[PDB]
Design an enzyme around this catalytic site. Structure first.
Site, PDB file in Angstrom:
ATOM      1  N   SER A 108      18.948   4.691  -4.488  1.00 22.30           N
ATOM      2  CA  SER A 108      19.739   5.295  -3.438  1.00 22.30           C
ATOM      3  C   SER A 108      19.326   4.780  -2.074  1.00 22.30           C
ATOM      4  O   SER A 108      18.686   5.472  -1.286  1.00 22.30           O
ATOM      5  CB  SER A 108      19.572   6.805  -3.484  1.00 22.30           C
ATOM      6  OG  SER A 108      19.827   7.249  -4.790  1.00 22.30           O
ATOM      7  N   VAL A 165       8.805  -1.557  -9.801  1.00 22.32           N
ATOM      8  CA  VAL A 165       9.426  -1.251  -8.541  1.00 22.32           C
ATOM      9  C   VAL A 165      10.890  -1.015  -8.775  1.00 22.32           C
ATOM     10  O   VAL A 165      11.517  -1.780  -9.495  1.00 22.32           O
ATOM     11  CB  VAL A 165       9.274  -2.407  -7.569  1.00 22.32           C
ATOM     12  CG1 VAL A 165      10.130  -2.149  -6.348  1.00 22.32           C
ATOM     13  CG2 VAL A 165       7.824  -2.582  -7.189  1.00 22.32           C
ATOM     14  N   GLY A 210       0.815  -1.202   0.000  1.00 22.71           N
ATOM     15  CA  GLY A 210       0.000   0.000   0.000  1.00 22.71           C
ATOM     16  C   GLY A 210       0.855   1.260   0.000  1.00 22.71           C
ATOM     17  O   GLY A 210       1.874   1.343   0.695  1.00 22.71           O
ATOM     18  N   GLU A 215       4.771  -9.487   7.923  1.00 15.11           N
ATOM     19  CA  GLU A 215       5.202  -8.618   6.857  1.00 15.11           C
ATOM     20  C   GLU A 215       6.266  -9.352   6.056  1.00 15.11           C
ATOM     21  O   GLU A 215       7.001 -10.176   6.591  1.00 15.11           O
ATOM     22  CB  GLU A 215       5.739  -7.305   7.402  1.00 15.11           C
ATOM     23  CG  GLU A 215       6.817  -7.412   8.440  1.00 15.11           C
ATOM     24  CD  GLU A 215       7.429  -6.047   8.732  1.00 15.11           C
ATOM     25  OE1 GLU A 215       6.663  -5.046   8.878  1.00 15.11           O
ATOM     26  OE2 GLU A 215       8.681  -5.982   8.819  1.00 15.11           O
ATOM     27  N   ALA A 261      14.556   0.295  -6.609  1.00 15.03           N
ATOM     28  CA  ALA A 261      15.232   0.803  -5.444  1.00 15.03           C
ATOM     29  C   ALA A 261      15.914   2.054  -5.984  1.00 15.03           C
ATOM     30  O   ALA A 261      16.149   2.142  -7.189  1.00 15.03           O
ATOM     31  CB  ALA A 261      16.250  -0.202  -4.986  1.00 15.03           C
TER      32      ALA A 261
END
EC number: 2.4.2.36
Lengths: 823, 207
Positions: B61, B57, B43, B155, B59
């Site tokens: 830094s 998606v 979310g 998670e 990444a």
């Protein structure tokens, strides 16, 4: 013609020679046309800020001889005429009164064939009620000849009836004090003509021609040119019987020396009898100029008629010789325009149109200027003189010499002449003239009074209200023009003080107005000008308010997402008086918290303790909703204030019942627990908490909804007054008062009309009262519905559900549990 | 494209545009047919969501000394739901709602998904996660699933390499624009989305 600021100023000093008037006329009766003709003739032009055309300056000079025919003090052969603009449709009630209120004379346009139409008849009464001297013009005569091909006598008889109808209204509704104000063609107060071809005449014009051809003083020549007066061609004698010694008929004088010349030109020209035209023309001394000579048909007639009887002069003649100057009319209009003592030092100064007395400047309306989104005040100086730099008392609608409410002792930045579309700076301006002020826009919403006497009451205020009670959602039909809508909306709000464009959280573009028609118009101008782009407009909607009836059943609680911060609060009702006090500037968000607390404490029964802990108002930081900080010893508390407030501005703009605004909601923050480190107490965390706790507290404090209600004032002949009550009784109307104008058969009923029941009101009122009624409604108050918004079947709940579906929300209203901590 | 068909998809405070449950069912079926599996929900804010779905998606830094750097997601939409919103107010002070994302990985990477009972922050966690994955943290082409904190929900943390190999699509589970901060109401979850939401069976022993 072009004039210098001096010339205008100089001309504005001789008030005895100024004419403040309007043009009462249905739009389909050449209103705009005739008006133009005066402009294209006597329109005043000055020898980069533009405004919305509100008034036009007209110049006209007459002969010393003519000046004598004026039965009212004058001085000079020069005259300044202020033609004040009027609405197109009667529905604009409030602003129709506005123009009339600042005028003294009135050019009433009637139709030849149709005569006096209902609407014009209505406006005339109103005019008369303000004590306006009428002057008539029977327009569209051409249709009579061309289409109907009427005879000279039939046309005469028509004018006769028409003038008769008008005077039936004039005598029935004008004040006995004013004296006989009826129009009489023989007295030069009635003109005939056609705006189309651009011609018009007065009996006084032909009387000045035939003046000597008969060796008469025009006094008796024009007197014979109307009514039963006959000139035997044979005996060459004037008689008073329509038959000669033998029994044969005699053509009236009017039909002989006025209607005949005209009728022939029409017959000659329109029949292309080139042999007669030239002869006929030379006789009336009408000289075609080169190029015009070849014209034929309408083209020609149109030129001949203009040269023959210039429409503009006929009308300017009646305005100067018969309409009252700012001196004659104020004497008998003052008392009616001053809401104070009829012997007050100012009311007197009004009667006397005294430029030396304390200022008494009336602001009829605020007009949009090009200079930013600022507005210039338009009005009339009924007393004293207004000057640039002068500091004046700006007395708003709610002002009363006693208190200090609605007062703004400021300084008039600049005084300008409203030369139609352009402004022209001028030092001062003595009583009796229509002028424009610069620098009041932020003190006066629309109407108001400007004075100097600290003991001066306001002048007959015109009720107006800026309360958005009707609004719609605007969408572009073709997504490409989206940026053009975003601009027009910005533009729209800029042109009108009372329109409102904003964005809901859902992101929709909203347009809210004072009423059904006022919003209606706004939308037109948007899809045609400000944006000119095709739009998808949602059906009209009424604006409600969300409120509470008691104190939250139990304490409300919510915690941030971190689960590290908690806000405890309770919501409770605010008294209508306090809410009103807020809406009306008494209790103000910008005050000194100390001074303001003293007020709430004293005048409104509030603990000075609570009142000094007001954190903010809402929505838009000034609404009738408050957050009181009743917490005790909460470390860092101040570090989350801006957020709590922020949260409050949203919670109050779109409440939890169905997204409407909150009203009279007192939110008391009982406790707060925060994370020790600031990182975990930012806006992202507190704003949602506070926002949700408020909803909880609100939903627990017994929720209710308020609907807006109008105060309709209606003018209507005793005969039709029936239809008023008829309609009010089918709209949940509540009569407040009914009164009759002393002399006349004119009643004036006042009632409360629920805004959500006013759609198509004027239309229904029209059928019901035969068109004789003249409505004027304004927003009056908020009414709390009894029923439970939460119950779908209840009357409020009905509103709520519908609304929620419309908004595509969950049909049902959220329980407080949803917002309370999910514990 | 993995979004099923039916017109451009975008994220709105108003709700996700052009994303019915039926469309979701098609796009899911098709993701499986290309050998992808669903591993959880993610979310976040409207702007973010858009990026992930159209651009994937990525990444950017990270703190290379941050041993638990990765892409956090959750099997339980409810736990993901709590992050579906602006994390800081806009200039006016509005905190609008976000969106719920369904994260998919190439089925060919399940060998790298592990699970534990320790809570990912605890001292032992580091060492035990490293034991399961076969190398020191950070995670890389592997993922760890554990309790968000003692007793809390679970998670999942996909390591950045694995994260950038996901394929994310909208959920038919809407965030509430009028209750930002409330907890996802179980009844607003489509039964049909529920059906396609089982999680793979992660390994508890190293490979």
């Amino acid at each position: 013609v072009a004039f210098t600021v001096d010339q205008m100023r100089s001309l504005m000093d001789k008030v005895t020679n100024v004419r403040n008037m309007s043009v009462i006329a249905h739009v389909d009766h050449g209103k705009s046309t005739l008006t133009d003709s005066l402009v294209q003739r006597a329109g005043i032009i000055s020898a980069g800020i533009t405004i919305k055309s509100t008034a036009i300056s007209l110049y006209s000079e007459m002969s010393d001889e003519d000046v004598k025919e004026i039965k009212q003090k004058t001085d000079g052969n020069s005259f300044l005429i202020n033609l004040i603009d009027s609405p197109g449709h009667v529905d604009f009630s409030s602003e129709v009164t506005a123009a009339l209120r600042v005028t003294d004379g009135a050019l009433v346009v009637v139709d030849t064939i149709e005569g006096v139409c209902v609407q014009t008849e209505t406006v005339l009464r109103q005019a008369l009620g303000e004590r306006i001297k009428p002057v008539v013009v029977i327009n569209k005569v051409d249709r009579a000849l061309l289409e109907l091909q009427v005879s000279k006598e039939d046309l005469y008889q028509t004018f006769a009836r028409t003038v008769e109808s008008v005077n039936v209204i004039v005598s029935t509704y004008a004040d006995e004090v004013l004296g006989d104000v009826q129009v009489y063609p023989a007295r030069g107060t009635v003109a005939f003509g056609s705006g189309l071809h651009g011609w018009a005449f007065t009996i006084r014009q032909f009387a000045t021609r035939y003046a000597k051809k008969f060796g008469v003083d025009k006094a008796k020549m024009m007197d014979r040119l109307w009514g039963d007066s006959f000139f035997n061609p044979k005996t060459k004698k004037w008689t008073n019987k329509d038959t000669d010694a033998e029994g044969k008929p005699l053509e009236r004088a009017f039909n002989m020396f006025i209607l005949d010349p005209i009728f022939r030109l029409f017959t000659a020209i329109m029949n292309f009898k080139k042999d007669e035209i030239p002869v006929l023309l030379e006789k009336l001394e009408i000289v075609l100029k080169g190029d015009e000579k070849d014209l034929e048909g309408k083209a020609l007639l149109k030129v001949v008629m203009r040269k023959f009887l210039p429409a503009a002069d006929a009308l300017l003649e009646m305005i100067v010789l018969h309409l009252p100057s700012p001196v004659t009319a104020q004497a008998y209009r003052a008392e009616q325009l001053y809401e104070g003592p009829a012997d007050d030092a100012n009311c007197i100064a009004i009667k006397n149109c005294d430029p030396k007395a304390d200022l008494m400047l009336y602001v009829s309306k605020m007009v949009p200027t090009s200079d930013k989104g600022r507005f210039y005040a338009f009005g009339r100086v009924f007393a004293g003189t207004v000057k640039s730099g002068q500091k004046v008392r700006i007395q708003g609608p709610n002002y009363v010499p006693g208190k200090k409410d609605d007062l703004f002792i400021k300084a008039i930045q600049r005084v300008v002449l409203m030369m139609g579309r352009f402004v022209e700076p001028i030092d001062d301006c003595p009583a009796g003239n229509i002028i424009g002020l610069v620098g009041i826009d932020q003190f006066l919403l629309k109407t108001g009074t400007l004075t100097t006497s600290e003991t001066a009451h306001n002048m007959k205020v015109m009720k107006f209200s800026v309360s958005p009670v009707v609004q719609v959602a605007v969408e572009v039909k073709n997504a490409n023009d989206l940026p053009k809508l975003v601009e027009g909306l910005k533009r729209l709000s800029k042109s009108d003080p009372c329109v409102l464009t904003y964005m809901s959280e859902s992101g929709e573009h909203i347009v809210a107005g004072t009423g059904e028609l006022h919003l209606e118009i706004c939308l037109q101008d948007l899809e045609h000008d400000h944006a000119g782009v095709p739009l998808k407009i949602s059906p009209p909607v009424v604006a409600y308010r969300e409120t509470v009836e008691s104190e939250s059943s139990q304490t409300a609680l919510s915690k941030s997402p971190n689960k590290h911060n908690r806000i405890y609060l309770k919501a409770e009702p605010i008294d209508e008086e306090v809410s009103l006090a807020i809406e009306n500037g008494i209790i103000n968000p910008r005050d000194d918290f100390k001074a303001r607390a003293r007020i709430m404490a004293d005048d409104y029964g509030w603990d000075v303790t609570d009142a000094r802990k007001i954190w903010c108002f809402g929505p838009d930081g000034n609404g009738p909703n408050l957050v009181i900080d009743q917490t005790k010893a909460v470390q860092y508390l101040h570090e989350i204030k801006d957020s709590v407030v922020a949260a409050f501005q949203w919670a109050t703009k779109e409440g939890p019942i169905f997204g409407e605004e909150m009203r009279s909601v007192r939110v008391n923050i009982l406790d707060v627990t925060l994370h020790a480190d600031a990182i975990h107490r930012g806006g992202g965390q507190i704003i949602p908490t506070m926002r949700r706790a408020t909803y909880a507290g609100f939903l627990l404090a017994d929720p209710k909804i308020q609907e807006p209600v109008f105060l309709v004032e209606i003018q209507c002949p005793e005969q039709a007054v029936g239809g008023i009550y008829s309609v009010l009784n089918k709209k949940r109307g509540q009569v407040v008062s009914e009164e009759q104008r002393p002399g006349t058969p004119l009643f004036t009923v006042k009632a409360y009309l629920p805004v959500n029941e006013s759609f198509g009101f004027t239309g229904e009122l029209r059928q019901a009262t035969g068109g004789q009624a003249f409505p004027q409604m304004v927003f009056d108050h908020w009414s709390t519905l009894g029923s439970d918004p939460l119950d779908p079947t209840s009357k409020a709940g009905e509103i709520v559900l519908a609304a929620r579906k419309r908004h595509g929300m969950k049909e049902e209203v959220p329980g407080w549990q949803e917002y309370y901590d999910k514990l | 494209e993995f979004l099923g068909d039916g017109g451009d998809v975008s994220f709105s405070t108003r709700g996700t545009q052009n994303w019915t449950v039926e469309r979701l069912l098609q796009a899911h079926r098709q993701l499986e047919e290309r050998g992808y599996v669903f591993v959880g929900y993610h979310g976040t804010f409207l702007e973010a969501a858009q990026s992930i779905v159209f651009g994937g998606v990525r990444a950017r830094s990270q703190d290379l000394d941050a041993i638990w750097r990765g892409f956090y997601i959750a099997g339980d939409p409810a736990l993901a739901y709590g992050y579906a919103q602006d994390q800081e107010p806009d200039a006016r002070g509005r905190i609008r709602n976000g969106a719920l994302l369904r994260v998919y990985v190439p089925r060919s990477s399940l060998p790298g998904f592990y699970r534990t009972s320790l809570t990912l922050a605890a001292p032992e966690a580091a060492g035990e996660v490293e034991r399961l994955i076969g190398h020191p943290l950070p995670l890389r082409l592997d993922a760890i699933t554990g309790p968000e904190e003692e007793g809390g929900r679970l998670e999942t943390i996909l390591g950045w390499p694995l994260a950038e190999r996901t394929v994310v699509i909208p959920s038919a589970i809407p965030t509430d624009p009028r209750n930002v901060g409330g907890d996802l109401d179980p009844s607003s979850i489509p039964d049909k989305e529920q059906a396609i939401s089982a999680l793979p069976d992660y390994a508890s022993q190293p490979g």
